[PDB]
Design an enzyme around this catalytic site. Structure first.
Site, short mmCIF file in Angstrom:
data_model
loop_
_atom_site.label_atom_id
_atom_site.label_comp_id
_atom_site.label_asym_id
_atom_site.label_seq_id
_atom_site.Cartn_x
_atom_site.Cartn_y
_atom_site.Cartn_z
N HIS A 86 0.82 -1.21 0.00
CA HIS A 86 0.00 0.00 0.00
C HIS A 86 0.85 1.27 0.00
CE1 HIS A 86 0.13 0.53 4.57
NE2 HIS A 86 0.09 1.79 4.17
N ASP B 160 -0.02 -7.44 2.02
CA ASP B 160 0.48 -6.07 1.97
C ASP B 160 2.01 -6.06 2.03
OD1 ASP B 160 0.59 -3.38 1.81
OD2 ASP B 160 -0.13 -2.98 3.87
N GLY C 49 2.55 6.96 8.39
CA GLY C 49 3.92 7.36 8.11
C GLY C 49 4.95 6.32 8.48
N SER D 104 4.11 3.12 7.90
CA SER D 104 3.77 2.04 6.99
C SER D 104 4.95 1.61 6.14
CB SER D 104 2.62 2.47 6.08
OG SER D 104 1.43 2.56 6.85
N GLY D 105 5.06 0.30 5.94
CA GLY D 105 6.14 -0.27 5.17
C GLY D 105 7.39 -0.59 5.96
#
Ligand SMILES: O[C@@H]1[C@@H](O)[C@@H](O)OC[C@H]1O
Ligand SMILES: O[C@@H]1[C@@H](O)[C@H](O)OC[C@H]1O
Ligand SMILES: [Ca+2]
Length: 223
Positions: free
Chosen positions: A40, A84, A175, A177-178
Site C-alpha cells: 500500500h 500487503d 507514516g 507504513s512499510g
C-alpha cells in the site's frame, strides 16, 4: 510511532525511508540491492534513503538511491490489505557498513509473546498530529491470534499478525507504513494497518513476513 522512544542515529541500520519529494513510508533493507515495504506504499518515482536519522538534515551517513523496479505482491488486495508486501530494487547497490546494513529474513514465524522492535518516522500522536524528524522506536510483543481476531473481527488473515498493547498508548501509526518489525534479529513484520493509532483494543496489524520468504527469495533470484 506513538509512545515510543528516540532510537538514536543509525541504531536501526536496516531502516529505510521511501522518498518521493518527502518521506511517505518506511522499508527494510534485506540485501545490498533490495528493500521490502508495504504494497500500500506503492507509487512511482521512489527514491530509497538509507542511513537516515533526521530526514530533514543531511548528517553524513545517507545513501540516496533511486528505485529501478517495484514488485507488488501478485495477490495484494488493497481493500483488505491482504498480502500487503512489495519489493523495491535499487538502481545501484548500497554500500553496506555498520550504519547501513541488511536485516535477515526469518526461517520460521515468530510466536505470540515474542518481543519485537518497530521503527519509523510516522505520527507520534494518537489524537493529534506531530511528525518527528528523527527515527522513533517501539518495543512491542506479538499478540495472540485470538486476541488479534477478536480486536478486528472478520479482518485478520493468515498473512497478518497483531503486535502492541491492548491497553493503548503505544503503537505504530501513519507514516510508519512499510517499515520493520524485527524480532530476535529477523524481519518478521511490515507495518501495515490499524484502526487509528494507539487506541484501546485496536493494536497494530502487520504483514506476516515469514509467509513470504519463498516469494521474496525467488523474486530476488530472477530480477
Ligand atoms: O479492515 C477492514 C477490511 O478488512 C475490510 O473489511 O474493509 C473494511 C476495513 O475496515
Ligand atoms: O552522495 C549522496 C549525497 O550527496 C547525499 O547527501 O546523500 C546520498 C548520497 O548518495
Ligand atoms: Ca538525514
Amino acid at each position: 510511532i506513538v509512545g515510543g522512544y528516540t532510537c538514536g542515529a543509525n541504531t536501526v541500520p536496516y531502516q529505510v525511508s521511501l522518498n518521493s519529494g518527502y518521506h511517505f513510508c518506511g522499508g527494510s533493507l534485506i540485501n545490498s540491492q533490495w528493500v521490502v515495504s508495504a504494497a500500500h506504499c506503492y507509487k512511482s518515482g521512489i527514491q530509497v534513503r538509507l542511513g537516515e536519522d533526521n530526514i530533514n538534515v543531511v548528517e553524513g551517513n545517507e545513501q540516496f538511491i533511486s528505485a529501478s523496479k517495484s514488485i507488488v505482491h501478485p495477490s495484494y488486495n488493497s481493500n483488505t490489505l491482504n498480502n500487503d508486501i512489495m519489493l523495491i530494487k535499487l538502481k545501484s547497490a548500497a554500500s553496506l557498513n555498520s550504519r547501513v546494513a541488511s536485516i535477515s529474513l526469518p526461517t520460521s514465524c515468530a510466536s505470540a509473546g515474542t518481543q519485537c522492535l518497530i521503527s519509523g518516522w510516522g505520527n507520534t500522536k494518537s489524537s493529534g498530529t506531530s511528525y518527528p524528524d528523527v527515527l522513533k522506536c517501539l518495543k512491542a510483543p506479538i499478540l495472540s491470534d485470538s486476541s488479534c481476531k477478536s480486536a478486528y473481527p472478520g479482518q485478520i488473515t493468515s498473512n497478518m499478525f497483531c503486535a502492541g498493547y491492548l491497553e493503548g498508548g503505544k503503537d505504530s501509526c501513519q507514516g510508519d507504513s512499510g517499515g520493520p518489525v524485527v524480532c530476535s534479529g529477523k524481519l518478521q513484520g511490515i507495518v501495515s494497518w490499524g484502526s487509528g493509532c494507539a487506541q484501546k483494543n485496536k493494536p497494530g496489524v502487520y504483514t506476516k513476513v515469514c509467509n513470504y520468504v519463498s516469494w521474496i527469495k525467488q523474486t530476488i533470484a530472477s530480477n
